[PDB]
RNA sequence: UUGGCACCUCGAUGUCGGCUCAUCGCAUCCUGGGGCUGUAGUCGGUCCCAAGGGUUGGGCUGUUCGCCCAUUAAAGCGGUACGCGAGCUGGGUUCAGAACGUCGUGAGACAGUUCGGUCCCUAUCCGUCGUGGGCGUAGGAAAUUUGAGAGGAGCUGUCCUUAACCGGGAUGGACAUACCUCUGGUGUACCAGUUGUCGUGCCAACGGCAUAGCUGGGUAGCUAUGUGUGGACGGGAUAAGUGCUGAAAGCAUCUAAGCAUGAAGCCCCCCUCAAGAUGAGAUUUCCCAACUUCGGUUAUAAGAUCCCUCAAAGAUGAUGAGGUUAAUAGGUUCGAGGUGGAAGCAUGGUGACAUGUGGAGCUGACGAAUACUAAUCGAUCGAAGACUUAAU
């Protein structure tokens, strides 16, 4: 245990409803945006390259590239601005962290699969 | 985290490829900037052709800083590079195409103008 | 760097206040009528 | 008006609606009661007295703090209460609406409320005068000799001599320090914990005061 | 953890050459400095001996040197052996111990205070 | 400032610039308050009160100055041995080498340049930053406190509204302070990959040494560049001013008696320290006998301490958690977080290797249980309350 007191003051609020993912996976979050007048959700879509933390203080971070340019996206875990996670593929590697692939591009930076 | 001497990639088609921070504007004493803020800075290296050339001392709006910016939800945004856009004091852009993504911090700013003409708006 | 006046005989003598030693917990053993220290072995048929 | 005593037990964090993140200190509030009041017509000023963490009854031969003593095992029983740990001021909360014997809980303060937090510093030990102050370190080459020394200490014949309060080094850490117009964000009183918005001084396991604020 | 005036590639030769001496003398006079750290190096190997299989007698011999034990009339013994067959017997229902710390004086030449570990 | 004088120092009072750290004056650079204007508004010009806080980064040059570039509400001026070399540096300047122009018959020299070129000291006293012991405070103790006195803090951009003043809002810059939940750093008794070589007899598994051999991660703690908070709203008395009633002076006049109003400044308000504040304060609790030659004395009480297990405290000491009627450390057991699939075995492959058994196995500081080992037996200190007066 952490401690009593806050796995028990923090205990409303972990989800229940995500699925279970590793690093080097793929997945699609379906975040939730306030613009100017409305709420729309915006997909982002990359690998997985992180996840650290415990209890509602969890974190994970995904990767992907724009136009050319790389942009990584770091989440709460249990935040409620989340809609929903799916998991498209499900990715071979060898570490708990992938900082290698900061420093890679095209087919040197491809992740197996199964 | 942009201070003086931070050379950063341009992103628009003004002409202009790299700049060189002079100035970061604000207050007294104000040593870094981030996404969202103007810096004053010189052309390095330009393009055969636009308006602005080698050597102009402009204007500038940052946009993806390679250490990223927080949101009040605890989420992160990083990218892999630093670059800007060179502006007109008016805070519209002086090229008509903007190059890579872009932070969505850049509407607090008011500069509508370069959110719209980016692709995908982060 | 280097002392001024040299130091009178008084002014050293109360510098010297604090610089003494105490006696040790010393008590007397059970098995012999001894002194030993406290939470230590008796030097004297070892027992404890 | 509105104090508690109680005990830091650590950092978390809480999502509020909007999505927002709050950081957040969970204080353990448990076991307060009222000893003593104080009045003016005999003490010269109005206070009460409050005692926080239950302690074990007097017992001869005893070698520590976790037991009462007969001076203190009295005073706690004139009040009808068991021996405290900690007893403390409590010179802002009007004295009538309170009695000798009660239990401060923690359901007085309510979510909304705006309060300061007192307690101890960590400890820090022996520190320097870039630690302990916020002074520059002199050139790390070029031929320096001077690399975390204070500066100079004075002037020269004008003054033969240094000025109260010039900064040296020495022991840094542990004061007494006020935190003002932090925020209660939760009430839990099945647990006795309360939910500050921020941080507060000192270690896990440090006595803290939350009062309500000043302005 | 305590760091006895050596540099940790020192400090760690100097524990395994500790345990495997509580292991083949049963009794040993330190300083009260080496006694209460080399304690715990010995005690996490007693329950390596008493778990028993074969990848718990792989990572006793990480810590353990290769000493022989002369056992009598000349029928000699490893210090890993005589820790999974004999030690790992005796102590096969305490659930922790083991070991035993005992102070004494100051010793002569520098006041260091001496002590003894045995096996309890 | 350039000087006049030559009174102090030739058995030595260390230059210029820069760095570190400041501290005081006001003849005010910004911010606060006012009078006059040739002040329509927005901007000003001038003079008065005001020292609380604030008062920038570069290019060129050893430079100080100065000139530029880009900013700022602003880029104040002076003293303090032209503050500060037993705090630092040593670039200029006036040590020995060498050279150019120039002067000299010459040795040499500067009415001038050029390249090179040794900065010692273990703090005795006052000073000042921390932290202990002794005695005192008319009995001995344990807590909680009042606050005489002291030290901090004091800055002000833009935007929206009113629609230029006066009014209301929202957000910044720079500084302070506390903290590690978050994003990061470190993490030499944590996990993993890998090279050379010598070993455990060999294979397989492992150990030494090579910067911790090297490389990829990383727990606690310590940390900023990270996360929170602060300078808020206000009172009293005034400054320059603006006045009201009002005479000396049959009118007038802010003044002599009276009465108001008025500043980022003054005294508070906020934050820390504070009965050695010898004027040593106050509350509510605890303990309270024997013996004399009646002078007083012992041990004991309540309380501590020694010694020992410790850390949230720490140079030491002090502070705190505990000492068997015990969870204080270790071990043991179960966990959190970290690593990222052990060994053995079997299968597939000719082989390097892959898959399964199985989120495996290990895991230092973090959260809980458990007396298995150590905090054993003991010892030292520590009260019986002076006499005057006045009331009960
Ligand atoms: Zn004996």
């Known amino acids: ?114 | 985290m942009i201070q003086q001497e931070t050379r950063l990639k341009v992103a628009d088609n003004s002409g202009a490829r790299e700049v060189l921070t002079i100035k970061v504007l604000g207050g007294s004493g104000r040593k870094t900037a981030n996404i969202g803020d103007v810096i004053v800075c010189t052309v390095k290296n330009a393009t055969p052709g636009g308006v602005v050339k080698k050597g102009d001392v402009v204007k500038a709006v940052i946009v993806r800083t390679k250490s990223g910016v927080r949101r009040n939800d605890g989420s992160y945004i990083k990218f892999d590079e630093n670059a800007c856009v060179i502006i007109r004091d008016d805070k519209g852009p002086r090229g008509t195409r903007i190059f890579g993504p872009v932070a969505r911090e850049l509407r607090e700013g008011n500069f509508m103008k370069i959110v719209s003409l980016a692709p995908e708006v982060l | ?48 | 008006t509105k104090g508690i005593l109680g005990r830091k037990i650590g950092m978390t964090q809480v999502f509020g609606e909007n999505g927002e993140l709050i950081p957040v200190t969970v204080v353990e509030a448990k076991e307060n009661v009222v000893l003593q009041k104080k009045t003016v017509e005999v003490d010269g000023y109005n206070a009460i007295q409050v005692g926080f963490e239950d302690k074990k009854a007097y017992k001869k031969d005893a070698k520590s703090n976790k037991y009462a003593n007969k001076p203190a095992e009295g005073h706690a029983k004139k009040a009808d209460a068991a021996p405290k740990r900690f007893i403390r001021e409590f010179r802002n909360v009007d004295v009538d609406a309170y009695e000798v014997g009660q239990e401060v809980s923690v359901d007085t303060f309510v979510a909304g409320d705006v309060i300061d937090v007192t307690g101890v510093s960590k400890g820090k030990g022996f520190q320097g005068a870039i630690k302990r102050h916020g002074q520059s370190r002199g050139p790390m080459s070029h031929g320096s000799h001077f690399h975390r020394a204070p500066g100079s200490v004075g002037m020269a014949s004008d003054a033969s001599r240094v000025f109260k309060g010039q900064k040296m080094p020495g022991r840094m850490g542990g004061n007494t320090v006020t935190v003002q117009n932090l925020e209660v964000v939760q009430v839990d009183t099945e647990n006795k914990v309360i939910l500050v918005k921020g941080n507060v001084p000192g270690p896990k396991k440090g006595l803290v005061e939350i009062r309500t604020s000043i302005k | 953890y305590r760091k006895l005036g050596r540099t940790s590639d020192q400090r760690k030769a100097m524990l395994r050459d500790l345990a495997t001496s509580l292991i083949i003398s049963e009794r040993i006079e330190t300083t009260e400095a080496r006694a209460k750290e080399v304690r715990s190096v010995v005690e996490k190997l007693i329950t390596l001996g008493k778990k028993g299989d074969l990848a718990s007698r792989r990572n006793a011999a990480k810590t353990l040197r290769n000493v022989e034990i002369l056992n009598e009339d000349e029928t000699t013994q490893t210090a890993l052996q005589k820790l999974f067959g004999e030690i790992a017997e005796r102590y096969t229902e305490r659930q922790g111990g083991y070991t035993r710390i005992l102070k004494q004086g100051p010793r002569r030449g520098d006041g260091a205070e001496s002590v003894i570990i045995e096996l309890v």
């Open chain 3, 1 to 48: 760097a280097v002392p001024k006046r040299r130091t009178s005989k008084t002014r050293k003598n109360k510098r010297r206040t604090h610089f003494k030693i105490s006696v040790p917990g010393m008590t007397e053993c059970p098995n012999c009528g001894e002194y030993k220290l406290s939470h230590r072995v008796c030097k004297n048929c070892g027992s404890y």
């Open chain 1, 1 to 114: 245990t952490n401690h009593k007191l806050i796995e028990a003051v923090t205990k409303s609020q972990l989800r229940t409803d995500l699925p279970s993912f590793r690093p080097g996976d793929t997945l699609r979050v379906h975040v939730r945006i306030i613009e100017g007048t409305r709420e729309r959700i915006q997909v982002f879509e990359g690998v997985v390259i992180k996840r650290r933390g415990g209890g509602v203080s969890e974190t994970f971070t995904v990767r992907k590239i724009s136009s050319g340019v790389g942009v990584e996206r770091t989440f709460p875990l249990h935040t409620p601005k989340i809609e929903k996670i799916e998991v498209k593929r499900r990715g071979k590697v060898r570490r708990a962290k992938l900082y290698y692939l900061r420093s890679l591009r095209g087919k040197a930076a491809r992740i197996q699969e199964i």
